[PDB]
C-alpha cells in the first residue's frame, strides 16, 4: 500500500486553517476525516467566538451579573483550563479580559486608542476569580458557568486556537491518522512524524518578528508537539507614530511592553502552549523562565530585539538558524 499526502485549507474562525496529512489509508477515509475537521471548525466558531452575536460565548456574556448558565462539557473544560493558567500566570493570561479587549477591538477598526477612563473602568470588570465553574456530581448533571462580577465578559481569543488544534488532533486520531501538520492561523500542531519510507520530524519555521513573514528566521524539528508563537506583529495598528499591538497587559490595560520580540511555546497540548505563549509575552523573559519551571514538560524559544535567540534545553538542539542575522545562544 502506498503513502499519499493530502492537504486542505479554508478561511474559518477568522483565519486561514490548513491541515496536511500523510497516510496509507484509503483516500476516501482521509477525505472523510478532513471533511470533519473543517465541519468541526465551523461548528466551533459558533461556540467560542467573542465577536459574533450568535455564539454560545456571546449568550454567556449576555448573562454577566446574573444566574449560572449551562454549557457543553467541552466549553466547560476549556474554561477550567483557562482559569488554571490565569491563576498560574498571575493574571498575565486572563480569559475575563473581554471588557478591555472590546474597547481595543473598536480601536483597531477606528485607528484610535481608547479613553483612559473607559479603560480604567473596563479594568474593574476583568476579575477572572469571579468566574464560577460548577458541575454536579450526579449522573448526567449539567455543567454551568456563572459570571459573578457585573459587566464582566469572557474572551477566549488567546487560547481558542490551541483548544481547536487539540480537538482536531483528537479527531484525526479517531480516524486512524497518525501523521499530520495542523496550522490554524499560525498555531501549529505536529502530529507524529512526516515521511521522506523514512519517517522524519516535522520542521516548523518561526518568523523574523520584524519580517514580512515570507521566510522563517529559524526552524525547529518536532514530533507530537504544538508550536505557538506570540509577537506584536500578529495584529496591530498605528496612530501618531505609535504601534498598538493586540497582546494586552492586564495591569495597564494597554499593549504589553516587554523585553522580547516573540516567544514560541512547545507543548504536548496546544491549549497549554497558546495560553503560555500569551502569558510569557506579557511577563517578559525572566518572569517567563520562572513560570515555565512550573511546567517541566514544556519548552520555549525567545527572540530578542537584538536578534539573539534563547531556547530551553528540551529543544535547543533541534533549532536551526536560517537567517544568519539571528544568533542562537547555547
Q: Which is nearer to Mg ion, 155 or 274 (CB)?
A: 274
Residue list 227-266, contact with Mg ion (CB under 5 A): none
Which window, 9-17, 57-65, 153-161, 298-306, contacts Mg ion (CB under 5 A)? 153-161
Nearer to Mg ion, 274 or 299 (CB): 274
CA distances from 10 to 14, 19, 185 (A): 10, 9, 11
d(CA 228, CA 275): 9
Q: Which residue is nearest to Mg ion (CB)?
A: 278
The answer to whether residue 155 forms part of the interface with Mg ion (CB under 5 A) is no
- 158 binds Mg ion per the rule CB under 5 A: yes
Residues touching Mg ion, count (CB under 5 A)? 4
Minimum distance of Mg ion from residue 247's CB (angstroms): 8
Residue nearer to Mg ion on the CB measure, 81 or 143: 81
User: Which of residues 30, 278, 279, 288 is near Mg ion by CB under 5 A?
Assistant: 278
SS3 sequence of the chain: CCCEEEEEEEEECCEEEEEEEEECCCHHHHHHHHHHHHHHHHHHHHHHCCCCCCCHHHHHHCCCCCCCEEECHHHHHHHHHHHHHHHHCCCCCCCCCHHHHHHHHHHHHHCCCCCHHHHHHHHHHCCHHHEEEEECCCCCCCEEEEECCCCCCCCCCCCHHHHHHHHHHHHHHHCCCCCEEEEECCEEEEECCEECCCEECEEEEEECCCCCCCCEEEEEEECCEEEEEEECCCCEEEECCEEEECCECCCCCCECCCCCCEEEEEECCHHHHHHHHHHHHHHCHHHHHHHHCCCCCCEEEEECCCCEEEECCCCHHHEEECCCCCEECC
Select 116 or 213, whichever has its Cβ closest to Mg ion.
Answer: 213
Q: Count other C-beta atoms under 10 Å from residue 213's C-beta.
A: 13
Smallest distance, Å, CB 200 to Mg ion? 28
Give the interface segment with Mg ion, choosing from 43-51, 172-180, 190-198, 267-275 (CB under 5 A): 267-275
Selected range binding Mg ion among 135-143, 211-219, 277-285, 306-314, rule: CB under 5 A: 277-285
Smallest distance from Mg ion to CB 277, Å: 5
Stretch that binds Mg ion, among 58-66, 71-79, 131-139, 278-286 (CB under 5 A): 278-286
Regarding 226 and contact with Mg ion (CB under 5 A), the answer is no
**Using CA atoms, how far apart are residues 231 and 227, in angstroms rounded to an integer?**
13
Q: Supply the minimum distance, in Å, between the C-beta of residue 137 and Mg ion.
A: 32
- Rounded CA separation 150/78 (Å): 22
* 33 versus 292: smaller Cβ distance to Mg ion: 292
Stretch that binds Mg ion, among 13-21, 101-109, 208-216, 272-280 (CB under 5 A): 272-280
| 160 scored as a contact of Mg ion (CB under 5 A) | no
| Closest CB to Mg ion among residues 13, 21 | 13
* Residue among 91 and 192 whose Cβ is closer to Mg ion: 91
Give the interface segment with Mg ion, choosing from 163-171, 178-186, 239-247, 269-277 (CB under 5 A): 269-277
Residues that bind Mg ion (CB under 5 A): 158, 274, 277-278
Amino acid at each position: 500500500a502506498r503513502v499519499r499526502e493530502y492537504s486542505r485549507a479554508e478561511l474559518v474562525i477568522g483565519t486561514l486553517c490548513r491541515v496536511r496529512v500523510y497516510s496509507k489509508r484509503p483516500a476516501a477515509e482521509v477525505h472523510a476525516a478532513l471533511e470533519e475537521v473543517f465541519t468541526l471548525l465551523q461548528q466551533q466558531e459558533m461556540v467560542l467566538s467573542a465577536n459574533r452575536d450568535d455564539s454560545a460565548l456571546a449568550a454567556l456574556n449576555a448573562q454577566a451579573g446574573s444566574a449560572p448558565v449551562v454549557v457543553d462539557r467541552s466549553l466547560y473544560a476549556l474554561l477550567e483550563r483557562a482559569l488554571f493558567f490565569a491563576e498560574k500566570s498571575g493574571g498575565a493570561f486572563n480569559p475575563a479580559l473581554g471588557a478591555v479587549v472590546k474597547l481595543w477591538n473598536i480601536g483597531f477598526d477606528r485607528a484610535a486608542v481608547p479613553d483612559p477612563d473607559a479603560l480604567k473602568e473596563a479594568l474593574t470588570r476583568c476579575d477572572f476569580r469571579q468566574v464560577h465553574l460548577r458541575a454536579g456530581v450526579s449522573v448526567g448533571a449539567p455543567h454551568t458557568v456563572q459570571l459573578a462580577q457585573a459587566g464582566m465578559q469572557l474572551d477566549l481569543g488567546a487560547i481558542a486556537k490551541g483548544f481547536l488544534a487539540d480537538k482536531i488532533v483528537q479527531l484525526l486520531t479517531a480516524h486512524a491518522l497518525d501523521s499530520a501538520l495542523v496550522d490554524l492561523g499560525g498555531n501549529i500542531f505536529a502530529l507524529g512524524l512526516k515521511y521522506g519510507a523514512q519517517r522524519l520530524e516535522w520542521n516548523v519555521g518561526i518568523r523574523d518578528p520584524h519580517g514580512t513573514g515570507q521566510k522563517p528566521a529559524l526552524v525547529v524539528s518536532v514530533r507530537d508537539c504544538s508550536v505557538v508563537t506570540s509577537g506584536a506583529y500578529e495584529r496591530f495598528f498605528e496612530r501618531d507614530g505609535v504601534r498598538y499591538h493586540h497582546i494586552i497587559d492586564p495591569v495597564t490595560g494597554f499593549p504589553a511592553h516587554t523585553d522580547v520580540d516573540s516567544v514560541s511555546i512547545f507543548a504536548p497540548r496546544s491549549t497549554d502552549a497558546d495560553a503560555l505563549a500569551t502569558a510569557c509575552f506579557v511577563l517578559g523573559y525572566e518572569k517567563s523562565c520562572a513560570l515555565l519551571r512550573e511546567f517541566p514538560g514544556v519548552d520555549a524559544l525567545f527572540i530578542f530585539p537584538d536578534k539573539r535567540v534563547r531556547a530551553s534545553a528540551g529543544i535547543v538542539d533541534r533549532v536551526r538558524v536560517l537567517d544568519a542575522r539571528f544568533v542562537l545562544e547555547r
